[PDB]
Amino acid sequence: DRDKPAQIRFSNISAAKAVADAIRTSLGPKGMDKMIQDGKGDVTITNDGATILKQMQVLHPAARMLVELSKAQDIEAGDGTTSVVIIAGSLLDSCTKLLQKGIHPTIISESFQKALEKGIEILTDMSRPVELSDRETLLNSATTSLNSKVVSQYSSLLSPMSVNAVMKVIDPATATSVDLRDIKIVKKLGGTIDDCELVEGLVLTQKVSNSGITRVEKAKIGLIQFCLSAPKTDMDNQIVVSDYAQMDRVLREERAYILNLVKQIKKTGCNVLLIQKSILRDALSDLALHFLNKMKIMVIKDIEREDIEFICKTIGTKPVAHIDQFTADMLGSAELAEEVNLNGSGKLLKITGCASPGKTVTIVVRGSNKLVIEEAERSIHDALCVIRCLVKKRALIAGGGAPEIELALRLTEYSRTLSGMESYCVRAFADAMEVIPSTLAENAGLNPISTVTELRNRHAQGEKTAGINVRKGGISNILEELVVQPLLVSVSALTLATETVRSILKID
Amino acid sequence: ADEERAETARLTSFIGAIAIGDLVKSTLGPKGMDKILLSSGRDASLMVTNDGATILKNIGVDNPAAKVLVDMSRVQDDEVGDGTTSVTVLAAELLREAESLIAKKIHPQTIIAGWREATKAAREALLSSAVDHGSDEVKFRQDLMNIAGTTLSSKLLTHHKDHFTKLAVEAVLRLKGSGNLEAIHIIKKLGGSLADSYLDEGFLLDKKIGVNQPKRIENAKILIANTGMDTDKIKIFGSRVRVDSTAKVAEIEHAEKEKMKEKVERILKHGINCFINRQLIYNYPEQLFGAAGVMAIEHADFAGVERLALVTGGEIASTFDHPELVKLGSCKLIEEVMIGEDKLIHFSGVALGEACTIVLRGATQQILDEAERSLHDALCVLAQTVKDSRTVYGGGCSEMLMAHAVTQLANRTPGKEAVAMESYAKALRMLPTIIADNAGYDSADLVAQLRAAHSEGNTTAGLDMREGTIGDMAILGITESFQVKRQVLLSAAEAAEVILRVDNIIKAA
Amino acid sequence: VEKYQQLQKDLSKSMSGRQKLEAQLTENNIVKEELALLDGSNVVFKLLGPVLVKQELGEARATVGKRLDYITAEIKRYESQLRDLERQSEQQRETLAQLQQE
Amino acid sequence: KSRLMGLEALKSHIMAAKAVANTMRTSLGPNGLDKMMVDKDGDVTVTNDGATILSMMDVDHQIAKLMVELSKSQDDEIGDGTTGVVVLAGALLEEAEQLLDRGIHPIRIADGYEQAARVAIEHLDKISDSVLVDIKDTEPLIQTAKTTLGSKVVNSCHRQMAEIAVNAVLTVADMERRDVDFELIKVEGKVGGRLEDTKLIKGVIVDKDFSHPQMPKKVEDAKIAILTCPFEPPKPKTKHKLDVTSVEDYKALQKYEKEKFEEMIQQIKETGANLAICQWGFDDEANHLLLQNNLPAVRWVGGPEIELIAIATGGRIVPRFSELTAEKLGFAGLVQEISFGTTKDKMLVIEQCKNSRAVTIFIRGGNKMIIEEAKRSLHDALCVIRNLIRDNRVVYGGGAAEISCALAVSQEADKCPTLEQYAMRAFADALEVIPMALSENSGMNPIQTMTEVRARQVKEMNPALGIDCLHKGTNDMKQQHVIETLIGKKQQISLATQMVRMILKIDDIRKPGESEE
Amino acid sequence: EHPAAKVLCELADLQDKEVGDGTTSVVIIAAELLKNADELVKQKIHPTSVISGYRLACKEAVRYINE
């Protein structure tokens, strides 16, 4: 019977739940890093559940879901991905209870996304909206969220760079979701984090020109989705391999064709030519390109066809497999096309001004070294995420697991008010909240069962007059030390586990 | 080879078909509890389905019924549309009845006649439960809406189905007593949004012709022709590849050029502004088509061109052997129009009134791919129900009823025949158990309540697993077409007794 | 037997003139040096085929970017004909020998 | 060298004698249950008789091995009774076991079985009617032409094949001097229409080669011109290069086709028909251009088929186009392209009233599965009338005859006695098992069934009654319309008695160490 | 045999890069440390709650070693 699935489910339950605890050890920065041996047989030390999910993992199906548990929250808010694992085992406990209570996993499921809709309101009831139209508010808030987080040093510097690059991809007063889509994060090997800079036309890998103009203004950006190499009738060459004599006349053929298509390039014309890799091509004849930049066209060669897809959408240089697809049509018009070799190492074609869809925003990442480059990458991304957290979900809420302490007691009664056989469900549903700050209270160190009992009254009283406050890690107003989070990291965490549980509940 | 007599076959015939019949009823109906699909030999890859047709493929099975009933599963699926998982366990609903009977020592011959003949007591109850819906336009709309969602409801996309549902029944609305799937044109294309989907009244070539060749033709004369301009289909005037000497490269190329320009004038000869080519339109002809204002559509929609020709009122040129004789497609306006992310050339006012073109717009192909397969089954049952405009009372309403009538027949005949007809009718009352079991409610009560409903008989009510409680079948919306629920009854009624039919199994692996 | 060296000949054939090109390769990079340093001082003809033709500078230049297509094309094609012939040569060696011995 | 005891072997004999005999016992008739074959390929297959399932089943013991050997003959001649001998073998044999387990010689009683055969055979020789005739047999045909098409592929009995199958026989029945063969008649399975789409042909039907319909489809006369050679320019059913020197020479190329259309048309026609099967397949062009020019020819043909039509015509093929002859063309009383299937081109129907040694029933089917099961179905009723046309004699049996022939032999045991007495006793009970063993396969007590007619046999002997093989409330033979050519049952009597004797063969139970190794 | 022993060698090696003095000590000290608080960590005490009064005492001890 579905008992065997329940067993399976229980076994999946058995797998997934102990896994969620391993991150509960890493819950919060007060939560502890976890040393991990890998196939290398070497230690791996992270407080990051998302990697601990990915890095060494069991492919058990319940465990398979839990990476996407965070990986959604990874891609949802970019943040709060520990919590979404820390929310998992809390119901997974309670769900087995109902299963142990004999509650039908549908009814179990059925009771939840139902009651989840409830909780988020009361959760949102706790919340304080900030101004998404105001750059500085968010520049204060996500910063305060960055201040609520570990990465500051560059994030401080990079909050304006984030929020501005965001504010530049903020058209709306709502500030929409602020897709990181329109953002191109580029790194340049030289420079410093001070030399990380927001650029309003795409900073492009390198540049490639033989006789091609070094920097062309008003650049018509070509793209080559067509093969510049003459057709391959033997190896790469329009010749066939037998003797010296017959091939040289069709060596003449390889000549003109590669030039003509190249001639045709500049004849419909471009100031710049996007060129993907020649492996991203069948083949591209350089003697054509030798003549193509000899036609004095600024060009880049060997760029990601996927970054091309980014380039196509952001600066409006559309995919071109044809001379005809060159007019100005699929060609983005780039006001200043130049590569900057400057500030130490690296060279990157930097579009300065363009004819571009949306507001095209690329940020250079320069750093004292590669590692210094590497470190600011989260700094923005962190900021960029808590931004795309809060701009996407307007209402801001404080962190520290308090809203869970706040929401549980209420949903327990809401369960009771809801009543019904599903009350016990929604009760157990409500009963998964404190678990996160519970382990978190240990993660800062405390007795949550002692501490959370009291905030729960505090959160019975002011609903937040206090909360586990990361430095304190204990009862005090978290709005006072400003440990803050957009509702997105919270809300985005809710549906996943529940649904994924709601999934595994129906799942045999 | 392994001679497998009744002793070996039955247990083996049950264990798969029963326990796999579990897996299909395991995921059954809206409350149907999903199965993790075990990708076996490939990764673990975890897949989660309410559909057993998936389960059929994933883990290979040697159980002969489970092997055979994969076809039984898909037959109702392939043909009757929805009812995939319905017919599957239906035989499992039976073999389990046959379990205690063969365990009663009962002959299949003793069983078969009973269940087989009890089918008609279920049939004629079903045939009585057959209730003509679509007899009225409102009913027809209702019956369209009642059946369409119900099909895809447990097919594991209900989400934006509501948008495709209407457009689909809006399309089959126009079929108006004659179901025509070529009348409606099915465009399934990733692009747009979850619902960007549009129902074009007409035919639609999704091709992007741009302004290079006409995107807009009023008084549109659609020339349906297979003409090759390089492959050079028959009525071909050229001369093939030959070398008599060093200069022979000249003669051959001038042979095809004339023909193309000549075939163009043949396409100019009809007076069409639209040349629909199932094959390539080369540069020279497409220039000469754009010279005449002729729309040049090369390699048009291959199932579409005829569907075009059907709905737009044309005829094929038959490999372009017709300088005239071909009949020309006529739609009011040909206009290239952006639907989703592509420029689609919408032929509106095609010569067929039942005709439509549905566009299916998913957000991702994962959203696009699943629905049309599920939506295909609705329009089938629709087309089925366009042919017999009907429902029957579901959620057990006809089941418990058909069971009753059979339980009656089990109380009327009851020789060794209705010793089986008993077990027969009980399976009719077992699916009503399973659906509440999918929900986790009381089958014991509700069924025997719906039996307490259908003992006296209740033709108006069934057990709503959505509600969790008993509910109307008036078409309360859970009332389902006579098309499916007769045929779901059909196929598995066969297979069970046919599974009974092989006592002897000889397995040479 | 005959099938042995039929393939190794045109192997060795297009092998050497290809390698002749390698000398000419340096020259084809040097002819990009020599003509580019010719502004029209000395009359530049292409030597391309047996007709020696009054030529222009771009005709001189574009030709040697096209003359490198000699070293480009002839070298590459043979690496096919190398193994294209080599394998069928190697194939036919043991087959017909074992026969005539057996 | 490992020698075992004949007893021990007799075990392995009887241990093999069961499941195979069992296989039929719930599979006997339509009241019997289907026989499934799953392959070395793992291929699920529903099977029939013995020989179908017996050959598919992989024979292991000498018995199993000897089974198919013996078993083929009953379906060869009779077409039916194959399922019975295997039942009959063990039934008597497994008592012959018990008899030898009494400490009885296989030696002594098996004679009695050979001897009680004849007296049951002769008792059989009493049973039912000694006669069927051309119009008479048709209804007993229709009787079996019911149950043969009322069995496997459908139980509906389309009277189509029911009276189509007999006609091919009836056509070739008299031909062979009251004989027929099933090459001499033929089941032609080809789909494109359902089971309800069938045919009887006096000759071959082939789907007539056409490289274009508008290039005229022409069939005429009665005659085919049989050619291994061209009626239009040849080609060995493979790739051929067609080149011309200049732009114009493509036109002269078709003239060569066009002339050698008529050149062959005018050559092959004068010798009869215009219709020439050409084993040579040709390119699209000349084929339709001859279809155009005149008088379609059949191209892309099986070398067997140009041979098949020839030997069907009883004349030869024209091997060489330089050669030709009328005998080497077709003897056909009709040749007509006829629409073949619903799905495809017109078949060329060669029905030979000039000379046909073979008259072939054709069958379409909605599946191969059904068209083969009907193809599987027919041979039986085809073979029973093969018995009829030689000896038109049938015996009501299957519960009339067994217990009948057993009863006299039961009595013969007491007349005869000693070694034959427990022979003829045990000889008899095996027969009475089959009708019993039908109520085994059927829903009825096998005992009380055998009991039933046992009362009726005490009442009346060799009854037009019998059991119910159709499981009708009436237990009949006449009105069950169950019956067998008294050839068949006797022939069926021979085989198990033959085999239960063959297990006795001489002495040697020793092997080199290899007997089944 | 351990990354724990590994990182400690590195720690003394860290200390060594500063000065070879205290390397053997800081190791020996770390063992002392871990053995001190692990008991408390074993006992009722959080691994987080402990090292507070340790590190901050590391502030205190140096504040004497400063004074």
Swiss-Prot record, chain A:
Q: Which residues carry this modification: N6-acetyllysine?
A: 263, 277, 294, 301
Q: Which GO terms describe its molecular function?
A: ATP binding; ATP hydrolysis activity; ATP-dependent protein folding chaperone; protein folding chaperone; RNA binding; unfolded protein binding
Q: Where in the cell is it found?
A: Cytoplasm; Melanosome; Cytoplasm, Cytoskeleton, Microtubule organizing center, Centrosome; Cytoplasm, Cytoskeleton, Cilium basal body
Chief location category: cytoplasm
Q: What is its EC number?
A: 3.6.1.-
* Keywords per UniProt: Acetylation, ATP-binding, Cell projection, Chaperone, Cytoplasm, Cytoskeleton, Hydrolase, Methylation, Nucleotide-binding, Phosphoprotein
What Pfam families does this protein's entry cite?
A: Cpn60_TCP1
PANTHER family with a match to the protein in the record: CHAPERONIN
Q: Which family does it belong to?
A: Belongs to the TCP-1 chaperonin family.
What biological function has been recorded for the protein in this entry?
Component of the chaperonin-containing T-complex (TRiC), a molecular chaperone complex that assists the folding of actin, tubulin and other proteins upon ATP hydrolysis. The TRiC complex mediates the folding of WRAP53/TCAB1, thereby regulating telomere maintenance. As part of the TRiC complex may play a role in the assembly of BBSome, a complex involved in ciliogenesis regulating transports vesicles to the cilia.
| Identification of the protein by name | T-complex protein 1 subunit delta
Q: Top-down, what is the taxonomic lineage of the species of origin?
A: Eukaryota, Metazoa, Chordata, Craniata, Vertebrata
From Swiss-Prot, chain B:
Instruction: Tell me what gene encodes this.
Output: CCT2
Q: Which domain of life is it from?
A: Eukaryota
The species this protein was found in:
Homo sapiens (Human)
- Quaternary data: Component of the chaperonin-containing T-complex (TRiC), a hexadecamer composed of two identical back-to-back stacked rings enclosing a protein folding chamber. Each ring is made up of eight different subunits: TCP1/CCT1, CCT2, CCT3, CCT4, CCT5, CCT6A/CCT6, CCT7, CCT8. Interacts with PACRG. Interacts with FLCN. Interacts with DLEC1. Interacts with SVEP1.
**Where, per UniProt, does this protein localize?**
Cytoplasm
Q: Quote the record's binding site residues for ATP.
A: 29, 83-85, 480, 485
Major location (coarse): cytoplasm
**Name of protein:** T-complex protein 1 subunit beta
UniProt EC number: 3.6.1.-
Q: Where does ADP bind?
A: 29, 83-86, 153-154, 395, 480, 485
From Swiss-Prot, chain C:
Task: Identify residues that carry N6-acetyllysine.
Answer: 9, 54
An example Gene Ontology biological process: chaperone-mediated protein folding
Example GO molecular function: unfolded protein binding
Q: Which residues cross the membrane?
A: none
**Ubl conjugation as UniProt keyword:** yes
What is the documented function of this protein?
Binds specifically to cytosolic chaperonin (c-CPN) and transfers target proteins to it. Binds to nascent polypeptide chain and promotes folding in an environment in which there are many competing pathways for nonnative proteins.
* Protein name (Swiss-Prot/TrEMBL): Prefoldin subunit 6
Superkingdom in the source lineage:
Eukaryota
| Record organism | Homo sapiens (Human)
The answer to keyword Cytoplasm applying to this record is: no
Q: Where is this cross-link: Glycyl lysine isopeptide (Lys-Gly) (interchain with G-Cter in SUMO1)?
A: 54
UniProtKB/Swiss-Prot annotation, chain E:
* Binding annotation for Mg(2+): 21
User: Where is this protein found?
Assistant: Cytoplasm, Cytosol; Cytoplasm, Cytoskeleton, Microtubule organizing center, Centrosome
Residues where ATP binds:
22-24
Annotated S-S bridges: none
Looking at the record's lineage, which domain of life comes first? Eukaryota
Binding of ADP, residues: 22-25
- What disorder is listed for this protein? Intellectual developmental disorder with polymicrogyria and seizures: An autosomal dominant neurologic disorder characterized by a broad phenotypic spectrum. Main clinical features are developmental delay of varying severity, intellectual disability, seizures, and polymicrogyria. Additional variable features are non-specific pyramidal or cerebellar signs, and visual impairment.
* Family according to the record: Belongs to the TCP-1 chaperonin family.
Describe the task this protein carries out: Component of the chaperonin-containing T-complex (TRiC), a molecular chaperone complex that assists the folding of actin, tubulin and other proteins upon ATP hydrolysis. The TRiC complex mediates the folding of WRAP53/TCAB1, thereby regulating telomere maintenance. As part of the TRiC complex may play a role in the assembly of BBSome, a complex involved in ciliogenesis regulating transports vesicles to the cilia.
**Name of protein:** T-complex protein 1 subunit alpha
The species this protein belongs to is: Homo sapiens
Gene from which this protein is expressed? TCP1
